[PDB]
Amino acid sequence: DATHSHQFTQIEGLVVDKNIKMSDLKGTLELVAKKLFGADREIRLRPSYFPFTEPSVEVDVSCFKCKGKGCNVCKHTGWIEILGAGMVHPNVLEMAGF
Amino acid sequence: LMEKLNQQLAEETIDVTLPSRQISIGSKHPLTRTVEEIEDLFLGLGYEIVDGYEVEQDYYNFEALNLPKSHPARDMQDSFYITDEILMRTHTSPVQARTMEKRNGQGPVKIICPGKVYRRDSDDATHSHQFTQIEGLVVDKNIKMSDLKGTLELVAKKLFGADREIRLRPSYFPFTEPSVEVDVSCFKCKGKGCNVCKHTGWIEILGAGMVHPNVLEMAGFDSNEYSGFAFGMGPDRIAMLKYGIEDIRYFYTNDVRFLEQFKAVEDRGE
Amino acid sequence: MLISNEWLKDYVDAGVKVEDLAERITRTGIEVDNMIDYSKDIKNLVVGYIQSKEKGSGNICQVDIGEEEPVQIVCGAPNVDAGQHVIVAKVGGRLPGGIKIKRAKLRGERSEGMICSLQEIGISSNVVPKAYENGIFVFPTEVEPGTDALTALYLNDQVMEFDLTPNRADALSMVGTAYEVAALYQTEMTKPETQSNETSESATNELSVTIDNPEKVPYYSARVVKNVSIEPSPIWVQARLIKAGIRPINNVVDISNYVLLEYGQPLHMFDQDHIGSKEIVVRQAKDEETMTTLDNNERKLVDTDIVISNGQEPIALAGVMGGDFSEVTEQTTNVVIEGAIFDPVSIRHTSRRLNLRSEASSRFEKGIATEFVDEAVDRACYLLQELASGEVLQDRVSSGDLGSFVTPIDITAEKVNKTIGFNLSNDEIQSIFRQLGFETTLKGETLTVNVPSRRKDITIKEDLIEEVARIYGYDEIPSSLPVFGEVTSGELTDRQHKTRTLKETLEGAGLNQAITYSLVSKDHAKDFALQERPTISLLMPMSEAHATLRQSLLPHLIEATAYNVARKNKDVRLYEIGRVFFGNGEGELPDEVEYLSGILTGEYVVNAWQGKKEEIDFFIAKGVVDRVAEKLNLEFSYKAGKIEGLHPGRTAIVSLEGQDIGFIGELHPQVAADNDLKRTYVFELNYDAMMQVAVGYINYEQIPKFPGVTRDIALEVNHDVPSSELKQIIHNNGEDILQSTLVFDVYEKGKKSVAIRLNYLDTEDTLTDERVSKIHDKILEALQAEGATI
Ligand SMILES: O=C(Nc1cccc(S(=O)(=O)N2CCN(c3ccccn3)CC2)c1)Nc1nccs1
Ligand SMILES: [Zn+2]
Ligand SMILES: [Zn+2]
Numbered sequence A: 001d002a003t004h005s006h007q008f009t010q011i012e013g014l015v016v017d018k019n020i021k022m023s024d025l026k027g028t029l030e031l032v033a034k035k036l037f038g039a040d041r042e043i044r045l046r047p048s049y050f051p052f053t054e055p056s057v058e059v060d061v062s063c064f065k066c067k068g069k070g071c072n073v074c075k076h077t078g079w080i081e082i083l084g085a086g087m088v089h090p091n092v093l094e095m096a097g098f
Numbered sequence B: 001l002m003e004k005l006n007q008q009l010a011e012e013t014i015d016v017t018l019p020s021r022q023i024s025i026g027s028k029h030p031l032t033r034t035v036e037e038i039e040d041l042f043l044g045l046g047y048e049i050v051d052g053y054e055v056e057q058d059y060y061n062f063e064a065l066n067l068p069k070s071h072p073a074r075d076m077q078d079s080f081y082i083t084d085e086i087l088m089r090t091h092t093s094p095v096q097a098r099t100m101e102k103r104n105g106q107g108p109v110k111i112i113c114p115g116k117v118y119r120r121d122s123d124d125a126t127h128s129h130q131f132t133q134i135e136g137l138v139v140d141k142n143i144k145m146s147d148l149k150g151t152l153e154l155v156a157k158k159l160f161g162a163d164r165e166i167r168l169r170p171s172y173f174p175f176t177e178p179s180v181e182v183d184v185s186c187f188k189c190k191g192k193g194c195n196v197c198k199h200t201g202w203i204e205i206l207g208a209g210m211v212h213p214n215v216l217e218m219a220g221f222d223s224n225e226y227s228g229f230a231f232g233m234g235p236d237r238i239a240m241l242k243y244g245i246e247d248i249r250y251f252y253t254n255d256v257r258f259l260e261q262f263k264a265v266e267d268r269g270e
Numbered sequence C: 001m002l003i004s005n006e007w008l009k010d011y012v013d014a015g016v017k018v019e020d021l022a023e024r025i026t027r028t029g030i031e032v033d034n035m036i037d038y039s040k041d042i043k044n045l046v047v048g049y050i051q052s053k054e055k056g057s058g059n060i061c062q063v064d065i066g067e068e069e070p071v072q073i074v075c076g077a078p079n080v081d082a083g084q085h086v087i088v089a090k091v092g093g094r095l096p097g098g099i100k101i102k103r104a105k106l107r108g109e110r111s112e113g114m115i116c117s118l119q120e121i122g123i124s125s126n127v128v129p130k131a132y133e134n135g136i137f138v139f140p141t142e143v144e145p146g147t148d149a150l151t152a153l154y155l156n157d158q159v160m161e162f163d164l165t166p167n168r169a170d171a172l173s174m175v176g177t178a179y180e181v182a183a184l185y186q187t188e189m190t191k192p193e194t195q196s197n198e199t200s201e202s203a204t205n206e207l208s209v210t211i212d213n214p215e216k217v218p219y220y221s222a223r224v225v226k227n228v229s230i231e232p233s234p235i236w237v238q239a240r241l242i243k244a245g246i247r248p249i250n251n252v253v254d255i256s257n258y259v260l261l262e263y264g265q266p267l268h269m270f271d272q273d274h275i276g277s278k279e280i281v282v283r284q285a286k287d288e289e290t291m292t293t294l295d296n297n298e299r300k301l302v303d304t305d306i307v308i309s310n311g312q313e314p315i316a317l318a319g320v321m322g323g324d325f326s327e328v329t330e331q332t333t334n335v336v337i338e339g340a341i342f343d344p345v346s347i348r349h350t351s352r353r354l355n356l357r358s359e360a361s362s363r364f365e366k367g368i369a370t371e372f373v374d375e376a377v378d379r380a381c382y383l384l385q386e387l388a389s390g391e392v393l394q395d396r397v398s399s400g401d402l403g404s405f406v407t408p409i410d411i412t413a414e415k416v417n418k419t420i421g422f423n424l425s426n427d428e429i430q431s432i433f434r435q436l437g438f439e440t441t442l443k444g445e446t447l448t449v450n451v452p453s454r455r456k457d458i459t460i461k462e463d464l465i466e467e468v469a470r471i472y473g474y475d476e477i478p479s480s481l482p483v484f485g486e487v488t489s490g491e492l493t494d495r496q497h498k499t500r501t502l503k504e505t506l507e508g509a510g511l512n513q514a515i516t517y518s519l520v521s522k523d524h525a526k527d528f529a530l531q532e533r534p535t536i537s538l539l540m541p542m543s544e545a546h547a548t549l550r551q552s553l554l555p556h557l558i559e560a561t562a563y564n565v566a567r568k569n570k571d572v573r574l575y576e577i578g579r580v581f582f583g584n585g586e587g588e589l590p591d592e593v594e595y596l597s598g599i600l601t602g603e604y605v606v607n608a609w610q611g612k613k614e615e616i617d618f619f620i621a622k623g624v625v626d627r628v629a630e631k632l633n634l635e636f637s638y639k640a641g642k643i644e645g646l647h648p649g650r651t652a653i654v655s656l657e658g659q660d661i662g663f664i665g666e667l668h669p670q671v672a673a674d675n676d677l678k679r680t681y682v683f684e685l686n687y688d689a690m691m692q693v694a695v696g697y698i699n700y701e702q703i704p705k706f707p708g709v710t711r712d713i714a715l716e717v718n719h720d721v722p723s724s725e726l727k728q729i730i731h732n733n734g735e736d737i738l739q740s741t742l743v744f745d746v747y748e749k750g751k752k753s754v755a756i757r758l759n760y761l762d763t764e765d766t767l768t769d770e771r772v773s774k775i776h777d778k779i780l781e782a783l784q785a786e787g788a789t790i
Helices: A022-037 A090-096 B004-008 B030-043 B093-102 B145-160 B213-219 B235-243 C018-027 C166-171 C174-185 C235-243 C251-263 C344-353 C359-365 C370-387 C413-420 C426-435 C461-472 C494-508 C554-566 C618-632 C669-674 C723-733 C769-786
Strands: A043-048 A053-062 A079-088 B055-057 B086-088 B109-118 B130-140 B166-171 B176-185 B202-211 B227-233 C002-004 C031-037 C043-054 C060-064 C071-074 C085-095 C104-106 C109-111 C158-163 C208-211 C219-226 C268-271 C279-284 C290-292 C298-300 C306-309 C314-317 C334-341 C397-400 C406-412 C439-443 C446-452 C572-582 C591-601 C603-607 C612-615 C637-640 C646-656 C659-667 C680-686 C709-714 C738-747 C751-760
Touching: A022 A043, A022 A053, A022 A079, A022 C413, A043 A079, A043 C461, A053 C461, A079 A090, B030 B109, B030 B130, B030 B145, B030 B235, B086 B109, B093 B109, B093 B130, B093 B213, B093 B227, B130 B145, B130 B235, B145 B166, B145 B176, B145 B202, B145 B227, B145 B235, B166 B202, B202 B213, B202 B235, B227 B235, C002 C235, C018 C031, C018 C158, C018 C174, C071 C109, C166 C174, C174 C251, C208 C219, C208 C397, C219 C279, C219 C370, C235 C251, C251 C268, C251 C359, C251 C370, C268 C314, C306 C344, C334 C370, C344 C359, C406 C413, C406 C461, C413 C426, C413 C461, C426 C439, C426 C446, C426 C461, C494 C572, C494 C618, C554 C572, C554 C591, C554 C680, C591 C618, C591 C659, C618 C646, C618 C659, C618 C680, C637 C723, C646 C680, C659 C669, C709 C769, C723 C738, C723 C751, C723 C769, C751 C769
Parallel strands: C208 C279
Antiparallel strands: A043 A053, A053 A079, B055 B086, B109 B130, B130 B227, B166 B176, B176 B202, B202 B227, C002 C158, C031 C158, C043 C060, C043 C085, C060 C071, C104 C109, C219 C334, C219 C397, C268 C334, C279 C306, C290 C298, C306 C314, C406 C446, C439 C446, C572 C591, C591 C680, C603 C612, C637 C646, C646 C659, C659 C680, C709 C751, C738 C751
């Protein structure tokens, strides 16, 4: 229907290195959000759960329309969910040989 | 109908071998191609690209690059002066000095400045009073000449292929110390030797070296804290090398028989 | 999951209104999707006692409402009687649905208020107990008239709905949620009473439990309570079930729903005097065993199903549905209570197959806390004592081992801080684990966190990292960027770069980038494919439109052009670079091959006021494909052809390096006509083939300082011969110095004239008239001999 497609598109990414932190995922997400929706964007990270990551987050961008009053676009919360993410899960690393 | 539409079918047969209606493509200038290639290499390493003035103050052209008012470089005979103090720029380093100073003494700096440059000379097949440079400048806190060397290696591969090696020869420029002149392994002869490389197997493509303390300090950076490397190259020369172009003036003459050879993509080959 | 505020306050007090509670729970991990207020839209609702009832000709009731004098209330409801405590909306009162309670007269007789059904105060029929479903509500026991009704009903309340992640089965219960809230607000939580006044008998002598499938049933216990009398549950049980979307049934059935909600442990009750035996046996079903569920449907079992049995016979589908004889009824007086752990996958599959999904079975699916299996049985035994006149036999009959109920996990603060980007001390980290109610000891710089089994999500120490971060706060996590120590410049690959460039040049020529659906109808999946090759069908398509992968881009690009044209968008120009799919046969990944195709119809160039209209034809379409070859520095050739959907005298095959890689052609006039399309052209190309040609650096030729020579020849041919064949010998004979050729004119009975302009040039050496005539005339001789006049 108008919000559901059996074929759609994703972009994922993956960084694996040696002292990689969630602060590092956060700075990366901030750039992504600015890239997409403007230099002034902020983000919000909410706890969540996906099997392949731990910790996990769901990621909002500050609404690019209403400053942060609230609007139709952001369901009058001033935050819009755009991404999920988090630390790669140990088992996922290890099944892959890292 | 299966008569009539069937013999319409046959009155409609064509030689599909005939010339298409061309939808013509314009060319990218060879000089722009080299500059953008190099833009792309360095964007991917976190650098910015900076433009500045083509007509410049002699402080930024010269004084700030460690050429005091004495210095022979500043001869009215070899640069296009407009007043005593103002002239066509001779290199893109003024832009990089103006840029550093604005940063008031905090790094990093990592910039690439391509542009048109100017020299008081007579024009022939290897000499142009207007030509092009790309320079760059990195200023940070434990910057080493090993770091300039790895950067040059990527540049040389970018331009002339993954297999290229470089050679560094000692040299002297007033704005750097140590200084080097930089060769690329010849991309034609493996390393036997050939016309292209004057049978030495090495071709000079760049100069570079560590930014000179005075240059850092006149711009406000602290040379006890910050080191620095910089480098220049000349797309006119690079592109005459790469393609066997016979006359530097061909870049600025805009014969379409020259320009229109440069429509197509290229690759790493094999 | 539905959590009543009222109820939760039995176990923990956060000291805060329900909206601030919801917000802090949401912030720290558990989404409160909404809040249901049971007080909403109700004013002046009080308890009445119905003192007397006359029905000489409506029901006229005298009702004590805690005032000086009784009020008369006319009530038409089939179950209303004297003796009953009830719900009264007073005059002045409001109820949901915008109902107003007025002083009134029914059939000439005063009514001062109204006695209510649960529905009439906003309760869904779905969860109204059968007794009061089609009349009014009656409190199971005595309450002081004039008392606030919603308060007496335990419905002066707000209820949080959690939308929980699979992570957090612990909050599938009141006791789990109270542990979470107690951490958040750093306040004490209290579990309920489960100690019963136990008799002199033991269930050890009542009952045996044996487990036959221990791979599949980690645990099974039972307790026995005798001499239960079945009657309504108290109103707080009723109302709490209701608030949680469960219909109250009676005191015993209700206890097991209640303790499911309270502790998260599914419980089952059997009539002890109707098990049919004194052995319980857990095992797999046998293949094509039958049972009949409480349900009276007959259930074909498979061996993957776990049943409960006695000895000959299944008395239930374990964890899923009771059978049709062992169940609690109105007559029941002795009960056995099950507390078992059944395998999550077994339960998930059985309930799904038989469409017997319940709140209780979903608890088994999402995994059971070992720490509460016995305690929750004990709680239901306690409640059965308290509310079912039950008599609680000592002991438990069980089979299997529950583990330890704590699992120690070691962690350092460096690992915490380095994973997150924090700088917390051991103190602050150790306090977080305690806050959460985890006993945590610091030996050196290593914390041992004793993780209780009621958090069964936490097993490894990355699990414990998330606790820290979510509790301390994701807001507080610092923004950094990783510094890579091995430096590489980020760039497009060659193929990636060429593809950006190529898209640019197709867009530069007026073609819009399309993206079509990979999945086609099975009928069309082999449309335009040139090699015969297996197609790839989905086991379970949602649509016949989208059943099979695509061996061409053209079906959906044709569709897309059909669609635009129907909407009066007559000028359609599209291209796509996308995969097509070819079976490598069974159990093998297919070949996914990237194509470049497009489709064109309408005007290419239009300026009406000047009288300019250039209609797309075949050579425009070739021009597009020529322009792709130019930009990529590739040499394409073009020979006449016959394909599938195509005009057979306006179709060509396209070759690169002696490989055929695609085609161009006008659509067959039939296919056009089927799609209501005018003259239309498509092209399709193997982009993978294209991308294999390594083209290297551009080959520059020197600029000539003097002129070349141009001669125009005129030929006569088999009207019938490809121009390509002329161009080919000519160009085969012109050596060093033939620069270019052009067919600039054609005429056609039987032969055609080809005018061709030859351009000689030598940018390298001095061109001479003698070499140009030598070569020219060797050209015109190669031509004569491969069959050419003039
Ligand atoms: O330091 C540079 N660049 C630099 C370094 C070494 C070599 C070259 S080069 O080969 O292109 N050059 C061009 C100029 N030539 C000159 C110019 C005047 C005097 C002597 N020689 C030498 C060759 C460029 N710029 C900076 N900007 C800001 C701070 S430092
Ligand atoms: Zn908004
Ligand atoms: Zn050489």
